[PDB]
């Protein structure tokens, strides 16, 4: 059994958002679903829970007028609606089953700022040869990074993004043997959901 959450969202302040959490046909219709908030580099905060059959809920007093927990029995889906969104609502939100599973999380960015497409640059070097990929100037978070569509994953270090100043930037390194590159092809594959961009950049000597 596993819980699949809805994709990331960027919403303007004052507006409202609705997230989904879906499990297999069994567990959800009998188990309690909790909702938890986690701000980057911080601990966990319980928002509330919802009961299966009876549609009964319980809220943390801090979220009384912020969150609203609902469930669709027919589709095995629990929802969380957050209202009058503030920068303080920018965080990762998880759903957690009383019977064990947790969702992957849904990232929420509360910002006035505009959706920017990322600039993708191939980092060519000047036993093993290290290659790179720079992902500069994009908004909001997150982005997805793979090497050669996925056939390269072993010797890879993907780094977290940093904020400066509108606008986020992150990098990734791939260390393969001196014989592997440039005899065989190594390409970088970046994807930003918000800007609807899918970039593929070949690392060239």
């Amino acid at each position: 059994v596993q819980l699949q959450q809805s994709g990331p969202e960027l919403v303007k302040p004052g507006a409202s958002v609705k997230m989904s959490c879906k499990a297999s046909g069994y567990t959800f219709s009998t188990s309690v679903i909790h909702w938890v908030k986690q701000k980057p580099g911080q601990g966990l905060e319980w928002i509330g829970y919802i009961f299966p059959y009876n549609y009964g809920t319980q809220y943390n007093e801090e979220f009384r007028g912020k969150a609203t927990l609902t469930s669709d029995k027919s589709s095995n889906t629990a929802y969380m609606e957050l209202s009058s969104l503030t920068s303080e609502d920018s965080a990762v939100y998880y759903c957690a089953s009383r019977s064990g599973p947790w969702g992957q999380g849904t990232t929420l960015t509360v910002s006035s700022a505009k959706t920017t497409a990322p600039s993708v640059y191939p980092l060519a070097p000047v036993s093993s040869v290290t290659l790179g990929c720079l992902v500069k100037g994009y908004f909001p978070e997150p982005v997805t990074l793979t090497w050669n569509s996925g056939s390269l994953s072993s010797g890879v270090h993907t780094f977290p993004a940093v904020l400066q100043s509108d606008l986020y930037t992150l990098s990734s390194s791939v260390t393969v043997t001196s014989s592997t590159w440039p005899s065989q092809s190594i390409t970088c594959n970046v994807a930003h959901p918000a800007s609807s961009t899918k970039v593929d950049k070949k690392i060239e000597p």
Binding site: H34, V36, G43, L44, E45, W46, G48, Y49, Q58, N60, E61, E62, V92, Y94, A96, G100, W102, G103, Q104, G105, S119, Y121, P122, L123, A124, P125, V126, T130, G132, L134, K136, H157, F159, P160, A161, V162, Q164, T169, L170, S171, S173, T175
Partner: protein, 218 residues
């Protein structure tokens, strides 16, 4: 609200040694129905939490038998008989006896390995970035141990602190090492006015810096 105090704040342990994490509640977790609602979660780097233990001592499915949970009332304990690299992360206790439900602050578990030196790599601005009028110089300091490291950027014999954007990874389970990335952002022009670009790494493993350089005009 029930305050959940976790001790120690951090734990650094050698592979195969025992680990003990404490969780103390401000109120008894013994409920009106005779049950005790205390859960233990592990947050792995770049992952959502996962529950290891429920109702003081029950192990979740797939949780290795080296994990043991115990306690009663206001004092709880999570134990690892002989630690493994895949056990690293932040440990959180979760109470459900009182409302609102609350979590402990966390306990960071870092794995102890033999001190490794960073593999330094330097990258000049790509041709593409230079076309678009931008200039970023990237430097990777990969697979080192311990975590404390200093990245100094030198341009033509002088230190540069402006335009520097540093980013660290959390300890990898696969080799118990830390990695880091540094970026020096300049305008194409500032970049074109300088020639020698250095990435110095100051660590414990060597005396003294691990220097990587390139000449723009080369």
């Amino acid at each position: 609200d029930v305050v959940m105090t976790q001790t120690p704040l951090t734990l650094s342990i050698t592979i195969g040694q025992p680990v003990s994490i404490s969780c103390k509640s401000s109120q008894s977790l013994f409920a009106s129905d005779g049950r005790t609602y205390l859960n233990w979660l592990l947050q792995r780097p770049g992952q959502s939490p996962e529950r290891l233990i429920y109702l003081v001592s029950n192990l979740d499915s797939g949780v290795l038998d080296r994990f043991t949970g115990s306690g009663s009332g206001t004092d709880f304990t999570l134990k690892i008989s002989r630690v493994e690299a895949e056990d690293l992360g932040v440990y959180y206790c979760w109470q459900g006896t009182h409302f609102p439900q609350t979590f402990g602050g966390g306990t960071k578990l870092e794995i102890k390995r033999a001190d490794a030196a960073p593999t330094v790599s330097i990258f000049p601005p790509s041709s593409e970035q230079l076309t678009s009028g931008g200039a970023s110089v990237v430097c990777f300091l990969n697979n080192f141990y311990p975590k404390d490291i200093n990245v100094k950027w030198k341009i033509d014999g002088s230190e540069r602190q402006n335009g520097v954007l540093n980013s660290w990874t959390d300890q990898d389970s696969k080799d118990s090492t830390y990695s880091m990335s540094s970026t020096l952002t300049l305008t194409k022009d500032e970049y074109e006015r300088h020639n020698s670009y250095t990435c110095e790494a100051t660590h414990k493993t060597s005396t003294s810096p691990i220097v990587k350089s390139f000449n723009r005009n080369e």
